[PDB]
């Protein structure tokens, strides 16, 4: 489902975010 | 979406709820309104969620352990008994439903373990836990088990862990100290290491539960287990000549165990409070209203002083309210709901043996630090960012550090993502509070992709942030309430590891 | 809410069992204590919640309980221990319901009283009152019964008792039972008397006194 | 420790009103529940009144329902039994007692027992007026080896009479018979000494009536009758 895709680039921005700070 | 003109009631499966239907007709017959009863699986847990919603039953049924929580999120609506009423009850259990100086629920009875033995194998019951290896022993040798009872509920192996010392929370002039944890001192660490040394001394099974104990003592197969009233009817079935005695004294100290008040709280969704009232004092709280739910399921020592001489002529209620003599009242300030769930963990941990006795009471207290602590921190901001005004009520110092490290935190994001979160928000299609409700299902996906950081929590309470506050634009607003509470317990329920690995929010606010 | 005690008073020497129990009518709380009680002064809390010992009393007392009774046991009695003992309970409801208490004292061997009379002064006669006093001395157990007879007539009703508790060094009893009437119906009766029934008098002892002579 | 002491038990009239005032020291007075129970003179312990609840919950025995009232302060630490309408048989030695379980949640249960009592303090309901005692010798008329010589008191109030033989010299023997209330509402307290019945003529005994509240001091001689 594309709801899993969107959970899926919440944990990619929070990885990104995570790294960048 | 409680329907007008009808009741349902909520009421667990161990309980008399016949004896509730055989009312609920009675009430219908008389006031001609569709009465229903219900037990849905642990309802204690669903009538939140479900009322948090708008719908779920006309009166919902409960130990009044955690009615206060219900009370205070606002679920239960305040009742309004009349003096000449408040004075047909215990005082005692009124004062122990009684939240806040107010009455949120009407108590129905008073009850609290025994432990009941069949007089057939054991003529005479050991009077100290300390006798139970030998008698099993004995019981061993001719096929027997001498105790079985529920080890999957903190509630019945409570007893034990209170009995030396241990409490749940510390009273000081006057109000709890919710920072004040019992349930780790040498008091509990003596009982429930006598329960871990019992499971692996083979006298008993961890996997051992409320049906499976139950059954075992009915056919005869146990000779001792501890039980409350509900489960006399079972017992009286099946034909087991049996006795209900104090439970044992545990290192020369009574076990006490934590006395319940059966209550009934009307739902503050519900449009049909009054309907609810009249079930429950006209109806419900009367001598054969109570004696019909006895008769199906004796709940126990009533709470009505009426039929309290019909409650004496039982040595059973004497022995069980005996055992509550040693006990103490159920605390109902919110955090126990958390606080039992703390226990359960450790009880099951322990006794299946993955956790060390001090370990499980250690990881169980910093439950009741972690889950509250968490709590309120979701709550003040949630609101805050909502509304937009600072509640300027008070917190401790890491309440205060998390609460201003989050709001800059999350403002960052918030202001950083703006779009994705707007997209967002309109692809999920929240509305109504059923939907915020359902938002349990992006919680759990968040954390599903098998990694874990502090940046996708953050990321996450600022996304819960901008969901009150578009709920405010919507005007759902009471839709706030629920959704943190949301998120608290999936913290507690599948992060609790990391959140004490982590030292809790202080190791939160020091990562950010 | 009714609370019976039993035994109403009980003669114990040092080291003995003399338990003492207390019913609870038409009430189940398991609420209650036992308090012991020596003459004039507080009431001491001996234990609680019908089983557990107040901390600071000695082993020698235990609550043990018999369903819907509560009896109170002391391993071996000391002197100490001589006094009232009172039970009561704390109904589930809003309420305190005591015992009517029962005493402990000092068992010796049985000894009879000393009787003597005491017509009224002549002072109190010219007052315009009589008070004859009948006393007993130095007797075992408590329980002694004492009547006045006057000229062949019993007279029971205006009579009253008052009785010194044990005394020093032989742990016995005295009484003192006081008639009190008017001078004219002093006056026209002759001859008064006590009589004492007790344990060491193995009849009735007759002390007697006469109006005008001697 | 925990000392907790009551006043205010004096002299009231049938009908009358008064309150005992029972001060505590050494904890809060609102931080546990607190009885008022009485004791009559030679009579076993009864209780009067209870607070009980958290929030003040009250209770009282039929015999003191509502004419009795239990109030606490928690800024002077000091409970009240304000009673009206006082009767006669209401006397007796009023104990203000504590109770209190470490294990109290806002729901004060279980119940335990009284763990400490004040001093008591009797109050005393009657018409009487204070006056003397009125003393009555008692002469032996000699019995067997040893004879009885007394001093009837009657007629006194209120109490205590404290009674002596030769200023107190002599100690043995002696026996005080508690005085026992009379109709008329005056105490008669009753003293007799055992002696050697030779000594009748040879040897004084007088006795030393004392009533401090009336300021009396009778000192009477009792001498064998002609008989
Ligand atoms: O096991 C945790 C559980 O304990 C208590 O629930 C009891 C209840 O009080 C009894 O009335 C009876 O129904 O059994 C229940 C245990 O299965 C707490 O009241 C409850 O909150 C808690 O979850």
Redesign the pocket.
């Known amino acids: 489902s594309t709801m899993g895709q969107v959970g899926r680039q919440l944990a990619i921005i929070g990885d990104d975010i995570n790294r960048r700070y | 979406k409680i329907e007008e003109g009808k009741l349902v009631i909520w009421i667990?499966g161990?309980?008399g709820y016949n004896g509730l239907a055989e009312v609920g007709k009675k009430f219908e017959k008389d006031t001609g309104i569709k009465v229903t009863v219900e037990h849905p699986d642990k309802l204690?847990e669903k009538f939140p969620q479900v009322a948090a919603t708008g719908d779920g039953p006309d009166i919902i049924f409960?130990?009044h352990?955690?009615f206060g929580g219900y009370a205070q999120s606002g679920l239960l609506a305040e009742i309004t008994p009349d003096k000449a009423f408040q004075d047909k009850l215990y005082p005692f259990t009124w004062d122990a439903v009684r939240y806040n100086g107010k009455l949120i629920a009407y108590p129905i009875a008073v009850?609290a373990l025994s432990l009941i033995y069949n007089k057939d194998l054991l003529p005479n019951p050991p009077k100290t836990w300390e006798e139970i290896p030998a008698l099993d022993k004995e019981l061993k040798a001719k096929g027997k088990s001498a105790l079985m009872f529920?080890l999957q509920?903190?509630?019945?192996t409570w007893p034990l862990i209170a009995a030396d010392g241990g409490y749940a929370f510390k009273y000081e002039n006057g109000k709890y100290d919710i920072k004040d944890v019992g349930v780790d001192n040498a008091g509990a660490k003596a009982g429930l290491t006598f329960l871990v040394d019992l499971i692996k001394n083979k006298h008993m099974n961890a996997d051992t539960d409320?049906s499976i104990a139950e059954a075992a003592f009915n056919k005869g197969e146990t000779a001792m287990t501890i039980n409350?009233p509900?489960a006399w009817s079972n017992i009286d079935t099946s034909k087991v000549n049996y006795g209900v005695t104090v439970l044992p004294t545990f290192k020369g100290q009574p076990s006490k165990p934590?006395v319940?008040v059966?209550s009934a709280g009307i739902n503050a969704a519900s449009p049909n409070k009054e309907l609810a009232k009249e079930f429950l004092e006209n109806y419900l709280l009367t001598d054969e209203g109570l004696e019909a739910v006895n008769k199906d399921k004796p709940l126990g020592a009533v709470a009505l002083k009426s039929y309290e001489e019909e409650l004496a002529k039982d040595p059973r209620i004497a022995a069980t309210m005996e055992n509550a003599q040693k006990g103490e009242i159920?605390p109902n300030i919110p955090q126990?709901?958390a606080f039992?769930?703390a226990v359960?963990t450790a009880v099951i941990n322990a006794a299946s043996g993955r956790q060390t006795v001090d370990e499980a009471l250690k990881d169980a207290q910093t439950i009741i630090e972690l889950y509250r602590q968490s709590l309120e921190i979701i709550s003040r901001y949630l609101r805050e960012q909502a509304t937009g005004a600072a509640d300027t009520a008070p917190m401790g110092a890491t309440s205060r550090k998390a609460l201003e490290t989050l709001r800059r935190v999350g403002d960052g994001v918030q202001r950083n993502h703006e779009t994705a979160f707007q997209g967002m928000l309109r692809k999920l299609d929240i509305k109504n509070e059923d939907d915020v409700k359902s938002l349990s299902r992006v919680m759990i996906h968040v954390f599903s992709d098998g990694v874990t950081n502090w940046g996708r929590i953050v990321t996450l309470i600022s996304f819960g942030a901008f969901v009150a506050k578009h709920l405010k634009t919507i005007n759902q607003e009471s839709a706030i309430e629920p959704l943190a509470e949301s998120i608290t317990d999936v913290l507690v329920r599948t992060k609790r590891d990391w959140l004490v690995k982590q030292r809790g929010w202080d190791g939160f606010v020091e990562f950010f | 809410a009714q609370m019976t005690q039993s035994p109403s008073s009980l003669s114990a020497s040092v080291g003995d069992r003399v338990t003492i129990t207390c019913r609870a009518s038409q009430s189940v709380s398991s609420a209650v204590a036992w308090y012991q009680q020596k003459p004039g002064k507080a009431p001491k809390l001996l234990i609680y919640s019908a089983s557990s010992l107040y901390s600071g009393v000695p082993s020698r007392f235990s609550g043990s309980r018999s369903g819907t009774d509560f009896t109170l046991t002391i391993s071996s009695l000391q002197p100490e221990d001589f006094a009232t003992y009172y039970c009561q309970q704390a109904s589930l409801t809003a309420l305190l319901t005591f015992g009517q208490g029962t005493k402990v004292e000092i068992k010796r061997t049985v000894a009879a009283p000393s009787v003597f009379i005491f017509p009224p002064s002549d002072s109190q006669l010219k007052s315009g009152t009589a008070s004859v006093v009948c006393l007993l001395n130095n007797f075992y157990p408590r329980e002694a019964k004492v009547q006045w007879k006057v000229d062949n007539a019993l007279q029971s009703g205006n009579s009253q008792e008052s009785v010194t508790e044990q005394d020093s060094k032989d742990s016995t009893y005295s009484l003192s039972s006081t008639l009190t009437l008017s001078k004219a119906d002093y006056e026209k009766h002759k001859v008064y008397a006590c009589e004492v029934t007790h344990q060491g008098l193995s009849s009735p002892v007759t002390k007697s006194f006469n109006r005008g002579e001697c | 420790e925990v000392q907790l002491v009551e006043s205010g038990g004096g002299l009231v009239q049938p009908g009358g009103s008064l309150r005992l005032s029972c001060a505590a020291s050494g904890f809060n007075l609102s931080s546990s529940s607190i009885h008022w129970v009485r004791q009559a003179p030679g009579k076993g312990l009864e209780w009067v009144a209870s607070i009980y609840s958290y929030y003040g919950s009250t209770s009282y025995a039929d015999s003191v329902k509502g004419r009795f009232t239990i109030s606490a302060d928690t800024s002077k630490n000091t409970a009240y039994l304000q009673m009206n309408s006082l009767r006669a048989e209401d006397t007796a030695v009023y104990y203000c007692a504590r109770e209190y379980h470490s294990y109290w949640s806002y729901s004060w249960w279980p119940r335990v027992g009284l763990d400490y009592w004040g001093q008591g303090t009797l109050v005393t309901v009657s018409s009487a007026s204070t006056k003397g005692p009125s003393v009555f010798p008692l002469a032996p008329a000699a019995a067997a080896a040893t004879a009885a010589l007394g001093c009837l008191v009657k007629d006194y109030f209120p109490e205590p009479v404290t009674v002596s033989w030769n200023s107190g010299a002599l100690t043995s023997g002696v026996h005080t018979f508690p005085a026992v209330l009379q109709s008329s509402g005056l105490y008669s307290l009753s003293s007799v000494v055992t002696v050697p019945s030779s000594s009748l003529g040879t040897q004084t005994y007088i006795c030393n009536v004392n009533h401090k509240p009336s300021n009396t001091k009778v000192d009477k001689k009792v001498e064998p009758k002609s008989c």
């Open positions: 667990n161990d309980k204690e409960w130990a352990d955690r009850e529920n509920e903190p509630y019945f409320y409350g509900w934590f319940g059966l159920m126990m709901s039992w769930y359960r």
